[PDB]
Amino acid sequence: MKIGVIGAGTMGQGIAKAFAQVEGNTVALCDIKQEWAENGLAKIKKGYEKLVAKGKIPQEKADAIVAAITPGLKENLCADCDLIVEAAFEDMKVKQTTFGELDKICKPECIFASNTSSLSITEIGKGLSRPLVGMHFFNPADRMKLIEVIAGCNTPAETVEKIKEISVAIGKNPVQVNEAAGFVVNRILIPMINEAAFIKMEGVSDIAGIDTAMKLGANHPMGPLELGDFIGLDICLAIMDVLYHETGDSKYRACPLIRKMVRGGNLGCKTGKGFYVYNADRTKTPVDQ
Amino acid sequence: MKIGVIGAGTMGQGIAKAFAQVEGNTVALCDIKQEWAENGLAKIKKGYEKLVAKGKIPQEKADAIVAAITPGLKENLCADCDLIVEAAFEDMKVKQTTFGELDKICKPECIFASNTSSLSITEIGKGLSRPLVGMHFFNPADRMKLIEVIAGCNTPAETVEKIKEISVAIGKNPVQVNEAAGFVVNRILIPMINEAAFIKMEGVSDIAGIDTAMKLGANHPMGPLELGDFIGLDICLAIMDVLYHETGDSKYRACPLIRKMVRGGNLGCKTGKGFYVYNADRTKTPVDQ
Amino acid sequence: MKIGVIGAGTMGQGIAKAFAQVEGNTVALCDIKQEWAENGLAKIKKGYEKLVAKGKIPQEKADAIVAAITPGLKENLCADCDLIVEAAFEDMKVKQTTFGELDKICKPECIFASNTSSLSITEIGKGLSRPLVGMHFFNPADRMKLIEVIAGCNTPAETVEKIKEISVAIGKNPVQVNEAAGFVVNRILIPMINEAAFIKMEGVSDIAGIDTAMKLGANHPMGPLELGDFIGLDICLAIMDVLYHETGDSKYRACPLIRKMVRGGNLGCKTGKGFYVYNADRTKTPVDQ
Amino acid sequence: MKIGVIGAGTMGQGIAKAFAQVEGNTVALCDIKQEWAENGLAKIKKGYEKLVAKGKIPQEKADAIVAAITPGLKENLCADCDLIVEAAFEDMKVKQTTFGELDKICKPECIFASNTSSLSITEIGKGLSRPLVGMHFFNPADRMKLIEVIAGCNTPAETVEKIKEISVAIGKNPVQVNEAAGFVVNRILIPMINEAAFIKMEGVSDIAGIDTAMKLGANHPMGPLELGDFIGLDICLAIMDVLYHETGDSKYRACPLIRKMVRGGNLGCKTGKGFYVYNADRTKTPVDQ
Amino acid sequence: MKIGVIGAGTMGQGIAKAFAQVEGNTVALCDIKQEWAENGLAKIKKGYEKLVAKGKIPQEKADAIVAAITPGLKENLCADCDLIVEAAFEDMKVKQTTFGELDKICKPECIFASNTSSLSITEIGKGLSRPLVGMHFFNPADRMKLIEVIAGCNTPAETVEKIKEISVAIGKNPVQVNEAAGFVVNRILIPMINEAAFIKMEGVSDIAGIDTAMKLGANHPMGPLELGDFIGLDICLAIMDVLYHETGDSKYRACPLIRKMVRGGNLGCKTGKGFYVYNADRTKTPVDQ
Amino acid sequence: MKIGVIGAGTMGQGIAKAFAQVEGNTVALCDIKQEWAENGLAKIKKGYEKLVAKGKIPQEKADAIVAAITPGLKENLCADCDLIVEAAFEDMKVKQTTFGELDKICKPECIFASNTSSLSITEIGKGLSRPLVGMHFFNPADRMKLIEVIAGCNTPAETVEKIKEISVAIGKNPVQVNEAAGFVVNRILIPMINEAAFIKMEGVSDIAGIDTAMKLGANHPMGPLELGDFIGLDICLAIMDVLYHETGDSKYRACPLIRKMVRGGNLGCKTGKGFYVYNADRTKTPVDQ
């Protein structure tokens, strides 16, 4: 099958990889600009020469993967595609027009899916001719094997089974989700990080104490403060506000301490500082000390 | 050093083991009737009998462990204990009373600690003539490496470090906590579970779906529902209620579904049913199907 | 079938007539003392003698209905009973002890049912040898057709339908409720009254205009304030506190104005005064003027 | 008197009917352009061309009613008007522009009233030369007999009574409301529907079981979910969010299921599906089976 | 007039003084037993000679005041009093019975007033056969000019005016409150101190800087933390928990930092430590340092 | 030192005089127009010329303060300044750009401060080359002695000291605040006013009774309703909404009464009506009567 992947950003690249990894699957990596298409494609090229050179990929397998992936922009490429997985800018009117255009571009049998974490799958596919489903990947999508199959108000049960079967065609475990804010993982995980920021804000414990408590007591792989610096605190803060706005419940109000840090650019690793300082010399120190 | 452990239930066994796995650590495992204490030791001798039969521990240390835990009842035992770790029934006047009795019994230098998870360390030692501090273990205490050190309103810093030093001396990391509901672990962990039951209850995903989504989407060792069954859905409901009463915050309201199930005696593993049925075949079925 | 109705107050009387109006049904009207049983049996006959007047039921049938209901208490009367509908004091460990006594008394096939509106079905049938179900009648039980069948956490499916069958056997429409505070009608009806009381207390409109507006703008049979006086303002207040405590949600916080009135004994109709003064001369005046 | 109604939709139509059914009442229907106004007058004509032919009204009147209604648009007809009843588009600043235009068009002693449900009466007529009062009709305006008179912060008691006076002059009962979100009826009626959605979403019972529980246990003329579809789920959703935003109280938080259904265009009767499917053969099947 | 004051603790002695200060007023200080009723009166004498000793009262007037106050227990002295002011334990069943005993003892025209700030005036006079009204004083009662006349549900307006007249007659300014939790002063003043504890608990600023910011910013006499130490943090916590329970609104949830200090006996000025440690050498240090 | 004040409005002049009152302090008062700037200085002269002829301050000192305030626009004037106090429109991008321009103009050592009460100090300096700090004055700035020093997420401790030191050197008392909504004064003070309006609205007391119960009961200089009119109710409504929005906590929901009143132009003293009508003949009357 042929798969069109809208958006050549970090999530788009990882989704292109997840399909190119298998077999006869072809990936049309479209974006706004062919420059931005091949940009993401050169990024896919770079990594996939590395795990060659570290005895982790043969080469005639690393090459056949970038070979199934053809970049470019849509319109050109998505007419024959079997499935669209859009991974563009988490913006309602973007996704709506993008899907309106592809609605006349793609063949009638193409399945429409979006990777959105924070927008209504149902609202995205309102005035359309074909069902719109949610196919939620987890970065890096080419390694992580969970798929949340988001069902919308009008998404037929068959459109769901098809995605679950495709997911099981590329190596993932699909979990069915009837549309609600934060689905399952975000709705549970992000408020974990929020609670940790409230615990630090109220002088209950320190940054490093909270994280070693959470990983030696719940045997988690990371502390929640660590984890949020790794997700990006602007991601965390945005998820909290979606939950809060979708529910009307103060239970999901964001820690003011997260909204302060994000206002200051202290977003975590990607900005060198959030709850920890990632030193130009590689290691990790809590801003407590 | 000598350690008196009040309560021969599951926690006092685990705590008595964590001490007795080391060196000059003698233990006095006490309960309300000596019979019940001699019971607790019998279950200790029991596993330690298997661990030797699995080559996993020499007998020569496993016997020197049990030989250092002496069963009996306080008055007759904790008189020269250097430290008291109370782990009895989660009731206020029970703990104000046994600590009040222990204030006359034990020598002026013995430290008073409580393993409570749901009561105020500050209120448990209101009448005492010495400080009272929290020493929060996690079952199984002998295997779990975390101890939350809880300073009450009047716990001196010198006592708090004497708990940090004792915890390093038995292989554990002390996190210091200023007394607040849930400390760190439970305040983050049990609202995870509570959100998982809300998700099931609001028809978002299924029990098996939620659990595999949290261990794949976030790499948690267990699913939240699976985890509730294993801590005890009565513990979870209680911890949630303590949070809601201590703070007055609707955020920590407990999912009516967990109360529905605790009222039904469906508390998880220890009652054969919970979010999963623990079928006699030693497998595990989600009660969705 | 033979039915045992526990409690001889307004509801137990009404439930007995609901069953004795039928056919091969006979009722055991029990309470604490036999004087208290046949007391409610006395009211039932006199009510039927009033019906024999009017032209509404012949004295042949009025006698036939009453010859089915036997006064007395359990222990003597409820051993071959097939169904037990309880309607006693809205208090948990009474219903638990009352059902605990009937556990030995009633025969093993006898379904245990409760009419409770505010207690957890699940909790009452906790210790019991046999399941517990909700059979929620609506005053007056002999005329109102609605029955909410409440499933508890452990109510088997077959029990729920043995109760939907019987409800049709006496001319009711069963609606299945999966236990949750206030089930369906109260959880909607009672917060209607409560919001009406806030409208008065926050000065939005007067008492007659709030009631006029709702039966004119919504074609409702009564206005919420009138309805609150008719139900009993102490019933409405207890129900709101149940909704609020079961959910921990301030959405169901009771209007202080209703609590003020219940504290002053102004409970509605049964005390001659609530939101309206019920003049002993038949008429109804709002305490606004 | 002569009344200027602005807006020729469902409300404008019914509002002018209620005025033109009386006596010396002449009405100036207006809208954006007269193609829009003559439009509404024509729908008024058709319904009146059926209420005669069924035998229920004679033509003489059903001719003189439409005779007193003159279609068109403002500026040329609502100068000598006495009472303005705006019913245009539920958006603030156009209402502010609309009223400020008539501020100079109309004669000074002309009363300004608005029919708004979700907008501040006080805010609409801020900078105006003259008071602005609420005159909340209920669809259909020609027969529903309730009218809510909305007092704003600066709405003199005199303007309010001259609105009650006019209201008893056309058969309706006026209820004075002092401004607050949802007045009396929506604030009580729409959270009803909101709670019924929660009862469905939370698995408490099914769609048809909810609606028949509230029409048998409470003698309501329709079920809450029925009524939801009848009102328009988009309208219900909008009111629930005016209450929340105006109060800041999570008590009026919209049920996320209502919102999901609205995002998919499933609004109820006017789209053929909300909680029921409105079969094109005049039946009604709940979307539950 | 003759005044019966029920209770000889801090408040009773304060109300007795505030009456006997006038002239033709005699007070009947009654409490549990006479040496407790005789305890206050000596306490009262102590101050008043100091009041002469520092020529702030002649002895002429400091002895005529102690002369007007006759101790002993009720029943003996209250058969003829014009006004009764209960100042006993803030316990509902005590209040109800002492007033109930008083209902036969006092004469038909004796007014019943209570000084309670935390209990329902409506409920306290529920059974009684004459109006119950609130007369709320502020410690110390003899110098503080404000009285809050609490009208209960069934408290007649005539009873409010005579309470208002008496107040003006003893040199107070009365403010009419229709019963609601915290009346007016506590409802405003105590959430201030609660907010100040949150600021400190959340790291916003230190204990001294908050208190100097509120007196230098709002020109307040004392800082909210200072003031809480003065009132007694056990008192401030009790008002919050009453506000929270009466209203059901988490808006009145008590700072957990206040419950921690109270559980530890750090109540403020009356224990030597609160937000400030009070040095026996007359100064005051924030626990921040 | 030299100080550039940005904004010639009521807050900018106070800040100009507070610095120029001292000595070697010189001041640059800048605005959008220079006819806007020396408008603010000319009023400074007018004010100082009124206190000259009250015999309260001598001319030669009035002259000496005015002679150190040079008006005009930035760009020209603030190039050599050593402190920047921004007091312009409370408008997020206005400041972000105004501060962006200044960052080029001023020397590398000029400290940057904003007198903003409701905006984030961290966001205002999101991408500047230098740190940005809070310097919160109180109208009237030249007379009020409190300054809250506001540290944003990235504000260096030393920068916070330079503001503490400068504050002490111009006579003020600096309270350090780690940026949170409402700082200390407002976050405490404005919810008082807010709660006062909820008492009025819920019919608990009346406007003048509340305002006297606070200044007699708590020995406050003004009542909360009075203070509200004095600050401006639009400001109060605006601070209440920042808190609600910054926390997601309904604790800080604005009273609907105040929203109705601001939506009504009734803002207090500055519109001649709010909770009191500020009559033209100097006196003040509660709108209650």
Residue numbers in the entry:
A (entry chain C), B (entry chain A), C (entry chain E), D (entry chain F), E (entry chain D), F (entry chain B): 1 to 289
Paper text:
The A2HBD has elevated expression in F. prausnitzii A2-165 and is crucial for the transformation of acetoacetyl-CoA to 3-hydroxybutyryl-CoA in the butyrate cycle. The monomeric structure of A2HBD consists of two domains, N-terminal and C-terminal, with cofactor binding occurring at the N-terminal domain, while the C-terminal domain facilitates dimerization. The A2HBD protein exists as a hexamer in solution.
The crystal structure of apo-A2HBD was determined at 2.55 Å resolution. The apo form of A2HBD belonged to P21 space group with unit cell parameters a = 87.660 Å, b = 126.611 Å, c = 108.071 Å and α = 90 Å, β = 110.208, γ = 90 Å. The apo-A2HBD protein assembles into an asymmetrical hexameric configuration, wherein all six subunits adopt nearly identical conformations, displaying root-mean-square deviations (RMSD) for the Cα atoms within the range of 0.2 to 0.378 Å. In the asymmetric unit of crystals, it contains three dimers with three two-fold axes.
